[PDB]
Write an enzyme that holds these catalytic residues in place. Sequence first.
Site, PDB file in Angstrom:
ATOM      1  N   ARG A   1     -31.855 -17.956   9.110  1.00 42.35           N
ATOM      2  CA  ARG A   1     -32.989 -17.644   9.998  1.00 42.35           C
ATOM      3  C   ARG A   1     -32.880 -16.199  10.435  1.00 42.35           C
ATOM      4  NH1 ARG A   1     -32.882 -22.108  12.844  1.00 42.35           N
ATOM      5  NH2 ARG A   1     -34.361 -22.909  11.305  1.00 42.35           N
TER       6      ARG A   1
ATOM      7  N   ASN B   1     -36.930 -11.621  23.608  1.00 42.15           N
ATOM      8  CA  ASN B   1     -37.999 -11.606  22.605  1.00 42.15           C
ATOM      9  C   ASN B   1     -39.177 -12.443  23.060  1.00 42.15           C
ATOM     10  OD1 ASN B   1     -37.165 -14.295  21.520  1.00 42.15           O
ATOM     11  ND2 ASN B   1     -35.506 -13.193  20.485  1.00 42.15           N
TER      12      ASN B   1
ATOM     13  N   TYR C   1     -31.239 -23.453  24.271  1.00 38.11           N
ATOM     14  CA  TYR C   1     -30.879 -23.895  22.908  1.00 38.11           C
ATOM     15  C   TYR C   1     -29.612 -23.124  22.556  1.00 38.11           C
ATOM     16  CZ  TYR C   1     -31.399 -25.079  17.981  1.00 38.11           C
ATOM     17  OH  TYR C   1     -31.192 -25.584  16.750  1.00 38.11           O
TER      18      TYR C   1
ATOM     19  N   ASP D   1     -24.262 -25.215  12.464  1.00 39.48           N
ATOM     20  CA  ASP D   1     -24.985 -26.522  12.397  1.00 39.48           C
ATOM     21  C   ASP D   1     -25.155 -27.183  13.775  1.00 39.48           C
ATOM     22  OD1 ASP D   1     -24.783 -26.374   9.458  1.00 39.48           O
ATOM     23  OD2 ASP D   1     -22.687 -26.931   9.791  1.00 39.48           O
TER      24      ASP D   1
HETATM   25  N1  LIG Z   1     -43.118 -23.707  14.020  1.00 35.61           N
HETATM   26  C1  LIG Z   1     -41.803 -23.746  13.414  1.00 35.61           C
HETATM   27  N2  LIG Z   1     -41.719 -23.714  12.060  1.00 35.61           N
HETATM   28  C2  LIG Z   1     -40.558 -23.742  11.404  1.00 35.61           C
HETATM   29  O1  LIG Z   1     -40.478 -23.719  10.196  1.00 35.61           O
HETATM   30  C3  LIG Z   1     -39.397 -23.811  12.208  1.00 35.61           C
HETATM   31  N3  LIG Z   1     -38.082 -23.840  11.829  1.00 35.61           N
HETATM   32  C4  LIG Z   1     -37.378 -23.893  12.932  1.00 35.61           C
HETATM   33  N4  LIG Z   1     -38.166 -23.863  14.035  1.00 35.61           N
HETATM   34  C5  LIG Z   1     -37.402 -23.978  15.302  1.00 35.61           C
HETATM   35  O2  LIG Z   1     -36.618 -22.912  15.481  1.00 35.61           O
HETATM   36  C6  LIG Z   1     -35.737 -23.424  16.712  1.00 35.61           C
HETATM   37  C7  LIG Z   1     -34.603 -24.187  15.917  1.00 35.61           C
HETATM   38  O3  LIG Z   1     -35.043 -24.966  14.798  1.00 35.61           O
HETATM   39  P1  LIG Z   1     -34.019 -26.135  14.506  1.00 35.61           P
HETATM   40  O4  LIG Z   1     -33.359 -26.703  15.773  1.00 35.61           O
HETATM   41  O5  LIG Z   1     -34.650 -27.229  13.708  1.00 35.61           O
HETATM   42  O6  LIG Z   1     -32.869 -25.356  13.664  1.00 35.61           O
HETATM   43  P2  LIG Z   1     -31.797 -25.731  12.535  1.00 35.61           P
HETATM   44  O7  LIG Z   1     -31.033 -24.348  12.485  1.00 35.61           O
HETATM   45  O8  LIG Z   1     -30.985 -27.000  12.951  1.00 35.61           O
HETATM   46  S1  LIG Z   1     -32.800 -26.057  10.845  1.00 35.61           S
HETATM   47  C8  LIG Z   1     -36.703 -24.002  17.575  1.00 35.61           C
HETATM   48  O9  LIG Z   1     -36.213 -24.957  18.524  1.00 35.61           O
HETATM   49  C9  LIG Z   1     -37.921 -24.457  16.707  1.00 35.61           C
HETATM   50  O10 LIG Z   1     -38.134 -25.850  16.562  1.00 35.61           O
HETATM   51  C10 LIG Z   1     -39.480 -23.846  13.608  1.00 35.61           C
HETATM   52  N5  LIG Z   1     -40.723 -23.812  14.209  1.00 35.61           N
HETATM   53 MG   LIG Z   2     -28.563 -27.185  13.528  1.00 32.76          MG
HETATM   54 MG   LIG Z   3     -27.942 -23.748  15.034  1.00 33.42          MG
END
Ligand SMILES: Nc1nc(O)c2ncn([C@H]3O[C@H](COP(=O)(O)OP(O)(O)=S)[C@H](O)[C@@H]3O)c2n1
Ligand SMILES: [Mg+2]
Ligand SMILES: [Mg+2]
EC number: 3.6.1.15
Length: 174
Positions: free
Chosen positions: A22, A41, A84, A104
């Site tokens: 990311r 941000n 978070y 993770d």
């Molecule tokens: N609208 C949108 N679109 C996407 O493709 C997104 N991908 C992630 N977010 C999110 O970014 C953050 C984290 O996403 P996540 O907790 O699912 O992260 P991982 O690292 O466990 S996969 C936000 O909470 C938030 O949920 C996304 N938000």
């Molecule tokens: Mg994760």
């Molecule tokens: Mg993470």
Amino acid sequence: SIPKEGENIKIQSYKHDGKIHRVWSETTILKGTDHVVIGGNDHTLVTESDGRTWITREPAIVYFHSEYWFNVICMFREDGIYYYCNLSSPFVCDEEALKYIDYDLDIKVYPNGKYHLLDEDEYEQHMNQMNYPHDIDIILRRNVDILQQWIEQKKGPFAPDFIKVWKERYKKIR
Ligand SMILES: Nc1nc(O)c2ncn([C@H]3O[C@H](COP(=O)(O)OP(O)(O)=S)[C@H](O)[C@@H]3O)c2n1
Ligand SMILES: [Mg+2]
Ligand SMILES: [Mg+2]
């Protein structure tokens, strides 16, 4: 390598295997020291591992530590302040970006301070897939416990005075 107050930097999250996870395009630096980077941000571009871009919808303060294996995002949502928390390598900075490895596990903190540990299943799978060394597993589990204790103590970014100071600093510089 320590970013300067008023600098707009990129933040790049990687997996243990070196692939990008990311990327956040724009974070304004509020504090930069040896040990701590604080930024804000708001409506930053965010890029995923398939290249897709999305835009954040609300301001956030980010907290990075050079010693601790976690970083923290403080999100200013319409229904209150959420945190978070990413279990991670500590950060390094260079002219490209502030950089860390995402490991993770993450913790969500609700406005009233209650926390949930997330992604324990994903951590177990990825640790087997990418062969995380035992010492990294020990460090990450210890830092989950440290993070929970910081949340319960309202320590560091979890302090209400931290939020009052940096939320207002970011509101002025933006
Ligand atoms: N609208 C949108 N679109 C996407 O493709 C997104 N991908 C992630 N977010 C999110 O970014 C953050 C984290 O996403 P996540 O907790 O699912 O992260 P991982 O690292 O466990 S996969 C936000 O909470 C938030 O949920 C996304 N938000
Ligand atoms: Mg994760
Ligand atoms: Mg993470």
